[model samples]
Target: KPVSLSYRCPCRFFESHVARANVKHLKILNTPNCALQIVARLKNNNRQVCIDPKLKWIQEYLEKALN
Candidate 1:
């Protein structure tokens, strides 16, 4: 698949903590204006938007995954 001419930004946000089972993978985008733009694939294989890194649940998930 080909990407767009200009880089994409995640306009909407997940806002809340989605279950680990539902959210499959978190691909972090490093785009400047996006500020930790996370593209998550769900169990339903749906296209999702971004998440805030400052949130507690993601911090918990990250450490759990890291450990």
Candidate 2:
């Protein structure tokens, strides 16, 4: 028995189609705004003064972490 799709099958144009009974891979696709956020602390620089004031909190926290 062939599986069905909510929208048109992505493989409609293919001559040989491989279908799976379970579509667990679709969960990753359905997620709209998935992202990864990495916070890194760089050595103090004079140019950093031009950055956002929010970093004042980040800088204070990082300084405490180093001690």
Candidate 3:
């Protein structure tokens, strides 16, 4: 089976609107001494798009609408 890959919920990494109200006062006074990100997957190729989280927003909106 060909499975699609995406986050369960995607977030705007650098920007927030409603969240900005809550996030604005947050300050990271110090960077982590060592920071790393890792992703694991079975590899395959598919058609792709240059999409933003806004697309994830739409996908979620539609799912909620019909379900």
Candidate 4:
């Protein structure tokens, strides 16, 4: 049996392609906005300055956990 994962377009600049069911890697097709917005979010978490600020929070949490 194969495992499945969910994927979504994080911004308006990229399109998604169908992923192979048995594949083990997660691939992301991202827009420039997605990249910049992610950096912005990482730098500042107080307001709506980015597309996925939660990622910044998650990254910090993981960094603390593994370090």
Which candidate leads the pack in lDDT?
Answer: 1
Candidate 4, pairs of clashing residues: none
TM-score of candidate 3 to 2 decimals? 0.19
Between candidates 3 and 4, the one scoring higher on lDDT is 4
For candidate 4, lDDT tens digit of each residue in 9-65? 354322112112222323233465334222122122232122332344435643564
Which residue runs does candidate 4 get wrong by more than 4 Å?
Answer: 1-54
lDDT of 2 by residue, 12-40 (tens): 22211111221111111122343212122
Report RMSD (Å) for each prediction in the order shown.
7.6, 21.6, 16.9, 15.4
The lDDT, on a scale of 0 to 1, for candidate 4 is 0.32
Name the lDDT value of residue 12 in candidate 4: 35
For model 3, how does the per-residue alpha-carbon lDDT over 1-67 read when each residue is reduced to its tens digit?
9755654422213321222212212222122442221111111322121222244443364356344
Clashes of 2: 0
Clashing pairs in 2: none
Best by TM-score: 1
lDDT by residue (1-67, candidate 1, tens digit) is 9854564675454645565556767777677866656666666656575655555767786667554
Backbone atom clashes (below 3 Å) for every candidate: 0, 0, 0, 0
